[PDB]
Design a protein around this ligand. Structure first.
Ligand code: HEM
Ligand code: HEM
Ligand SMILES: Cc1ccc(-c2csc3ncc(C(=O)NCCc4cccc(Cl)c4)n23)cc1
Ligand SMILES: Cc1ccc(-c2csc3ncc(C(=O)NCCc4cccc(Cl)c4)n23)cc1
Lengths: 373, 373
């Protein structure tokens, strides 16, 4: 762990995200901040075309250009979708698309808003001395008023932070596998399982901050993409950067590195002969920061912990490994239970495909256990 | 150069491939060796459907179970595509599917024939002592008679080898970036550039040995997979193993580890952007020997050569870099020249999707140049 951009406190989240851009990009910042207003009042799209072409070079360091990608991503989502009710836009203005794509190419990310810049790069502590707890922090950007995006992004971010506690351990696991020290390894697996169960609570204790009208709410349509989307059948033209419409997938927490990482570590079959599930999740790595998608790979570069633990005929080891897998099914489940409270409930007078997707992943997790319970 | 299985003399190719399996696997070694005979006669699908389900216990050392993969592989393509005319099989026999997937999950490869299978692990020396040259060499397997097998696989392999002479220069490039030895880098870069030049020269001098009407021969039908293939809507069933029909891509020379690794090294980033071709080559990585994707990624873990050369304001070093890109572009252009000559022209008396895919891969290589202003 050196140049994988995994922070030891906040994990895959961008630590202390920059919340102010150079004055040069104030018009960008303005539209972005006042997203909820500009949309409902209708002038957003106008205020977007009002923008002249700005160069991205004044974005000197990593963090600033990161905030830029957030600012522009939102602006883009706001522009494409508008009030969200159906008035789409098939062409993104050159004075936005060109900077967006240039910077997007630079940071190695598709020119669409992703989990990495919408959750992990979209936050700040209120009082910089009080710890990272919900009541001490806030988002930087939301789409419309009462979309609960504050709570949605913040909790996910909090679960993301909570998982970092286990990342620290990973080298210990691979090292303890190499030098062949059962006791250290077993010890370390329990510690991971311990941290993954710690993540369950931040999920439990903090599920209070999303309103049952959040899917059916204005969100979800703002995180919608233009890949296989009937509304932009062929994708969005990024005017002055691409002669042709390009398709990019929308938002999915499949772009959260955390869960993929431990899916990999524990050898949970996430390539399992393809299938929408394992395949989707894979090509969702293309939407992760180049350093994180790189860390993921690197884990598979390492030998399987699952193949090791099997072969040792070690009861305490299996249980320890099972304890981690149990921790994931627990996580996936409470997530799934929370999801059903949000899809067949606000289906009141497409949403069942997701229900399957979740369940196939969770199932692949469950089938990984070594004691059937 | 460590645990990546990159032979000093033969690159990514299997060091010295095993010709004969263990005595046990003779029910297989027979079929595959007499495979052209058995397709035309229309007895292949039958002989396979009446076969002993030999267990994978007796194939042990690396060279053997890779030969096993090749054998089982061709057999599977023969059994699915039949004569190459219409008639198709959607299910693979328990007796041959199960030991194949047992060996596939074992060797961490997908249960389809691969470039690594039928090019890297498919050859021999007629005269064991003398150099690796065309006439000195012959393949181990084929599908039909005059089906263009030898030349295609052999020329590929010979270019793959020719290119490998550079893989050994890779560590220096990263050492010279670390120790910061400007001269050493420039030198090592010119050498890599020259290795690519030499491989194009090899391509020139042996291009003929590939049969002029190879694309249209049954070959392409036998190298067809079951991923986004209309003919196998849901993909092949490996029954006994997985109850569901599973989905895997047919052979593409985008599984050639060398070409991808020079893309990576020079920072051509074919694997970035999330676009159609971007996601493809990234997915083809899963169809490479495990030892090999790891190496590809290691390269990706390392600092960017392109970045380093851009930063230094060093025209000599810039030039030596371009030399490499030009050399990789030349390599691709000549390839595209012969692809046009073999596939476009004879179409008259998908054919475009292929031409487009190659062109972008070439274009995004040509675009990686430096000295432009
Ligand atoms: C509380 C409101 C939430 C709802 C309604 C919700 C809904 C969903 C839905 C519908 C999917 C499948 C569609 C997709 O993203 O591809 C999903 C996937 C996912 N969600 Fe959430 N989610 C919520 C909160 C969270 C939180 C707090 C986390 C933790 C960071 C999380 C992590 C994930 C992950 C990792 C996936 C990918 C599926 C997997 O790996 O199993 N979600 N979510
Ligand atoms: C002259 C006979 C050949 C023909 C007709 C031919 C045709 C093609 C076609 C149609 C593709 C795109 C389909 C795909 O693989 O996804 C392709 C890709 C490719 N071919 Fe060939 N090929 C030939 C010989 C070679 C040889 C000898 C090599 C050297 C190993 C080579 C290396 C590649 C590579 C690396 C790709 C991936 C795309 C790229 O890197 O630009 N080909 N070839
Ligand atoms: C840019 C971005 C990406 C992922 C997340 C995120 C964090 S936690 C989580 N679970 C699911 C998602 C997600 O965005 N999925 C798409 C569908 C969907 C989106 C929002 C609400 C609903 Cl109800 C359904 N997500 C947040 C932002
Ligand atoms: C399993 C396997 C994979 C790749 C190769 C190979 C080595 S060099 C090269 N160029 C293209 C390919 C290739 O097979 N691509 C598929 C399209 C195609 C192109 C030309 C002729 C035909 Cl018959 C088919 N290829 C050989 C075996």
């Amino acid at each position: 762990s050196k140049e994988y951009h995994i922070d030891e406190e906040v994990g895959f989240a961008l630590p202390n995200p920059q919340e102010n851009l150079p004055d040069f990009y104030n018009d960008w910042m303005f539209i972005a901040k006042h997203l909820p207003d500009l949309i409902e009042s209708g002038q957003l799209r106008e205020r977007v075309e009002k923008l002249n072409m700005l160069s991205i070079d004044h974005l000197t360091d990593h963090k600033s250009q990161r905030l830029a990608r957030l600012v522009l991503g939102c602006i883009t989502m706001a522009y494409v979708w508008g009030k969200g009710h159906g008035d789409v836009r098939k062409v993104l203005p050159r004075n936005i698309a060109v900077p967006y794509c240039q910077l997007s190419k630079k940071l190695e990310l598709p020119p669409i808003l992703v989990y990495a810049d919408c959750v992990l790069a979209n936050w700040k502590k209120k009082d910089p001395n009080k710890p990272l707890t919900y009541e001490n922090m806030d988002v930087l950007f939301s789409f419309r008023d009462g979309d609960c995006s504050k709570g949605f992004f913040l909790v996910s971010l909090l679960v993301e932070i909570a998982a970092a506690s286990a990342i620290k351990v990973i080298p210990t696991v691979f090292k303890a596998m190499q030098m062949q020290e059962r006791d250290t390894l077993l010890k370390a697996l329990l510690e991971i399982a311990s941290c993954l169960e710690k993540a369950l609570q931040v999920f439990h204790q903090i599920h209070d901050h999303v309103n049952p009208k959040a899917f059916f709410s204005v969100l979800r349509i703002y995180l919608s993409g233009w890949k296989g989307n009937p509304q932009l059948s062929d994708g969005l033209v990024y005017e002055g950067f691409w002669e042709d419409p390009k398709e990019f997938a929308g938002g999915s927490a499949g772009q959260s590195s955390v869960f993929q990482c431990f899916d990999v570590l524990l050898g949970i079959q996430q390539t399992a002969g393809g299938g929408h599930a394992a395949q989707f999740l894979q090509d969702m790595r293309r939407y992760m920061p180049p350093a994180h998608r790189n860390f993921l790979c690197s884990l598979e570069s390492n030998p399987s912990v699952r193949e090791f633990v099997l072969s040792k005929g070690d009861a305490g080891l299996r249980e320890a490994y099972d304890a981690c897998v149990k921790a994931l099914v627990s996580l996936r489940s409470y997530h799934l239970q929370i999801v059903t409270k949000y899809i067949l409930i606000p289906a009141s007078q497409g949403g069942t495909d997701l229900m399957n997707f979740l369940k196939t992943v969770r199932s692949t997790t469950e089938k990984s256990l070594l004691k059937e319970g």
